[PDB]
């Protein structure tokens with residue numbers, strides 16, 4: 001099944017690129033209808049970048065969740 005190719009790519013994508021900032025925690029994400037949105041930062045570093053006023057790492061990549069459009 002072609003959806004399983006997409007699910008294990010996403011599974012991988014998420015497990016091998018950790019938080020841009022701390023580079024150990026993995027990334028915050030959320031599901032938005034057909035897409036998985038992977039934020040660049042883990043939650044803790046994200047909240048901290050608001051406190052310290054850095055917004056250099058702010059951002060996300062969306063990924064279509066399914067093999068077919």
Ligand SMILES: Nc1ncnc2c1ncn2[C@@H]1O[C@H](COP(=O)(O)OP(=O)(O)O)[C@@H](O)[C@H]1O
Nearest residue numbers: 028029037039040041042043046057058059060
């Ligand atoms: N954990 C995080 N790491 C990096 N950037 C983030 C994180 N959470 C939110 N952001 C950024 O802050 C803004 C708010 O995003 P989000 O709540 O996904 O937008 P929307 O509310 O329109 O869905 C976006 O630029 C998003 O990329």
Ligand SMILES: [Zn+2]
Nearest residue numbers: 019022042045
């Ligand atoms: Zn982090």
